[PDB]
């Protein structure tokens, strides 16, 4: 599900004008918002204006700085990494998000266009073929786990 959430976030960053994709991407499990927060965001127009402005800033960082600076600024401003580490079971999700971010950086450094990386991510979502780099890694190494 994290690849689909990253695809929704990239579609909301690339096209922030239509509010449907932005509302579908903000209510995912990566952001971690309740239904009351989504309702107050849909009711208050100034908070939605601030959200559209900061997503336009994220789009400017995505067009100027790259993929990993935009994702790092999104994880630092929204503070979603601390919320995923505080949530029980979110460390595997955070490592999957970081691995998807590294693969998107490696695929977007070789692609000139910005929508081409989103098309590549959607194609790799639609293609479940297993490569050596596109497999799941270990979630944590310090904590001892039962190895199946």
């Amino acid at each position: 599900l994290e690849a689909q959430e990253m695809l929704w976030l990239l579609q909301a960053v690339m096209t922030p004008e239509r509010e449907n994709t932005l509302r579908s991407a903000l209510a995912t499990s990566m952001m971690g918002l309740n239904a009351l927060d989504i309702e107050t965001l849909n009711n208050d127009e100034h908070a939605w204006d601030v959200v559209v402005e900061e997503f336009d800033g994220y789009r400017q960082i995505w067009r100027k700085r790259g993929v990993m600076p935009m994702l790092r600024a999104l994880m630092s401003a929204r503070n979603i990494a601390e919320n995923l580490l505080a949530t029980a079971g979110g460390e595997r999700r955070l490592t999957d998000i970081l691995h998807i971010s590294e693969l998107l950086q490696e695929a977007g450094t070789q692609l000139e266009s910005e929508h081409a990386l989103v098309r590549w991510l959607s194609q790799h979502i639609l293609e479940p073929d297993s490569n050596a780099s596109s497999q799941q890694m270990r979630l944590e190494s310090d904590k001892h786990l039962v190895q199946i």
């Binding site: 503070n79 000139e112 194609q123």
Partner: protein, 684 residues
């Protein structure tokens, strides 16, 4: 400042020109043509916009365009001429849809395509302007030509499929320069024999990926570069990355028939000795600090990775040449291992690790991972929250049907207006040999709607064969025969008690709430619905809602629904009091589902209920055997097998919970016992 490999000026344009040079060897798959149309130069040559490409995506996907430009291309590849699922078949289909509506029928065993009808089918006239050109060079680049005839081949191609833009001037200039250089170097030897297309294509593909590694040095920013550019330049801080085994030093296999590899001399180029001297020059050139970093541990399975032989000899010379002042006289091998373990810094695997933020020798400067490593943040709160909601006066019946079809989806896409949009499926690379999924369901639905009026099934067979949805030859006839047999077996039960009925109006006032709507095909016997599906609880809930909204204003009689595999949903006629009570219960469930997400699973909750229900005594059993079988039925219906997509594999349920806890399972069980109970109570 990164001194790396130089990026191409126009990367998709060169790949598109390579694919255009690989035209007679290509199979003309629809994805390979849409990837060529993805380039804005080829789209701007034939006046195809991005909205036009977005229309052409679904126009190719829905009209059955899979592979093959012409029928002669199908016959050329040692394949039988089917005549369908080609680019000519799709072009004839789209032009017949521009001319004739799809409800008329076939003209030359080609069903028309009712989408492209107005001026937007002019974009089809752009696409037919492309593929014909894709025929011509297919007949142009097939035969071998001498080197004096390949000169106007590229340039007349460049004004064929490409348009000169502001960015792609240098790309076309480089293409013309490399092509003329290839032809000039070929004609300098005065080659007389014929040269095929694949040799020039591979020679152009080799001269477009020859971008040399950049060696530029900027004195301002910090220089990120490879080993060779500065070999002996004396920098103060020298860092060496990627010193693991296998990667560095590079070893290149000998050609096998070169005399220099058999007998080496002093001044001979070798990549191994050059890298082993580059490491020594980087060791000498370091003035103040040397920082050697390598991958010592894998990130996939945490396997031990060995470093290079040069770094191993370096740490061996360090351990055999130096000692720590702690153990001044302990041993030689123990002191060597202690020095090699003291100099080796085993860093953490993740950047949010609290080991990296301890004060002392090693401490990171990552301020973004500082509150994440301290674990001083709030966790993810629960998604279900009590929201304020006022039930309006006029609630339509369609809103209640969309609510009781899927309650969590109706809580997402209507209350807070969050609808998770999934991307559409890609176009398959072959014709459909079997029928499965949505196409089979649409074929069964149209066949059931045609056989319910005693229409000619052979005309619908020819209509489905003219569109390409059926398999070619006798297999489509066999599929149509078994589906016609199944739908005739279903229609012999459907039209056994079918009466002509019309749509009627529904106006109800329950709990001060107005319900206005329409019921289609209301016969005096009752309610008659037919769908080519399986026995499920969602269709039973829909029929129960229609029966409640039908019996509340007159309408004495039963309600019947006939699915496949002899499945039948029956509801007897009830009085107005019980119908209004159950409708008030459904209205209370609707107004409760808008505030909080009403956790009523239809399939799994219905399976648990019908495992626990006893229709003979009209009471739920409380023994442990039923409680152990209902858990098995709930786990079978929630998470399915490897062939059936279960109810838990859904984008609407993964947002609420990631793992099905037994507390939420008992909550879903209680909600299904509260709501889905008259479904199995009034079933017969």
């Amino acid at each position: 400042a990164i001194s790396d490999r130089r990026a191409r000026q126009s990367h998709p344009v060169l790949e598109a020109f390579i694919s255009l040079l690989s035209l007679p060897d290509s199979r003309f798959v629809s994805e390979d043509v849409l990837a060529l149309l993805d380039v804005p130069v080829l789209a701007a040559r034939f006046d195809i916009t991005e909205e036009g490409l977005r229309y052409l995506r679904q126009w190719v996907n829905e009209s059955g365009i899979r592979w093959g430009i012409d029928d002669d291309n199908v016959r050329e590849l040692e394949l039988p001429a089917t005549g369908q699922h080609t680019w000519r078949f799709g072009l004839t289909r789209m032009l017949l849809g521009y001319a004739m509506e799809s409800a008329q029928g076939e003209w030359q065993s080609v069903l028309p395509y009712d989408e492209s009808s107005g001026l937007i089918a002019e974009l089809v006239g752009h696409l037919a302007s492309l593929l014909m050109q894709l025929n011509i060079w297919r007949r142009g680049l097939a035969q071998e030509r001498p080197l004096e005839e390949w000169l106007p081949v590229c340039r007349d191609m460049l004004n064929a499929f490409f348009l000169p833009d502001a960015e792609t001037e240098a790309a076309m200039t480089l293409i013309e320069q490399q092509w003329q250089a290839i032809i000039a170097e070929g004609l300098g030897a005065q080659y007389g024999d014929a040269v095929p297309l694949s040799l020039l294509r591979d020679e152009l593909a080799q001269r477009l990926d020859q971008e040399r590694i950049s060696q530029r040095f900027l004195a301002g920013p910090v220089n990120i570069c490879t080993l060779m550019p500065m070999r002996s330049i004396p920098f103060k801080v020298v860092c060496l990355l990627g010193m693991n085994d296998g990667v560095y030093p590079r070893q290149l296999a000998p050609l096998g028939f070169d005399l220099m590899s058999q007998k080496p001399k002093r001044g001979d180029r070798s990549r191994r000795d050059d890298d082993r001297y580059l490491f020594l020059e980087a060791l000498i050139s370091a003035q103040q600090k040397l920082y050697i970093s390598y991958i010592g541990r894998s990130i996939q399975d945490n396997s031990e990775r060995f470093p290079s032989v040069l770094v191993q000899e370096l740490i061996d010379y360090i351990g055999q040449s130096h000692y720590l002042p702690g153990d001044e006289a302990l041993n030689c091998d123990e002191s060597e291992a202690r020095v090699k373990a003291h100099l080796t810094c085993l860093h953490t695997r993740m950047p949010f690790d609290p080991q990296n933020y301890q004060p002392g020798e090693r401490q990171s400067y990552a301020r973004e991972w500082l509150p994440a490593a301290s674990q001083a943040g709030k966790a993810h709160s629960e998604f279900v929250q009590p929201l304020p909601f006022t039930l309006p006066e006029t609630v339509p019946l369609e809103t209640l049907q969309r609510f009781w079809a899927h309650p969590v989806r109706a809580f997402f896409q209507m209350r807070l207006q969050v609808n998770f949009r999934t991307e559409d499926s890609e176009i398959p690379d072959t014709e459909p040999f079997i029928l499965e999924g949505l196409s089979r369901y649409q074929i069964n639905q149209q066949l059931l709607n045609a056989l319910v009026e005693q229409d000619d099934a052979e005309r619908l067979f020819r209509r489905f064969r003219a569109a390409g949805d059926l398999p070619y030859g006798a297999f489509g006839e066999i599929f149509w025969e078994t589906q016609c047999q199944e739908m005739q077996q279903l229609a012999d039960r459907v039209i056994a008690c079918r009466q002509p009925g019309q749509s009627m109006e529904i106006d109800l006032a329950c709990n001060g709430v107005q319900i206005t709507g329409w019921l289609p095909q209301v016969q005096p016997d009752g309610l008659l619905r037919w769908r080519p599906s399986l026995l499920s609880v969602a269709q039973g809930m829909q029929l129960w809602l229609e029966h409640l909204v039908y019996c509340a204003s007159g309408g004495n009689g039963e309600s019947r629904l006939f699915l496949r595999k002899d499945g039948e949903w029956r509801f007897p006629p009830l009085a107005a009091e019980q119908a209004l009570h159950y409708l008030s219960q459904l209205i209370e469930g609707y107004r409760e589902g808008m505030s909080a997400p009403l956790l009523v699973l239809p399939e799994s909750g219905g399976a648990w209920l019908k495992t626990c229900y006893d229709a003979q005594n009209d009471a739920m059993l409380d023994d442990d055997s039923t409680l152990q079988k209902a858990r098995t039925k709930f786990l079978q219906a929630y998470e399915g097998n490897m062939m059936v997509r279960g109810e838990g594999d859904d984008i609407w349920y993964q947002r609420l919970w990631r793992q099905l806890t037994p507390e939420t399972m008992e909550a879903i069980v209680e909600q299904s016992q509260r709501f889905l109970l008259p479904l199995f109570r009034f079933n017969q």
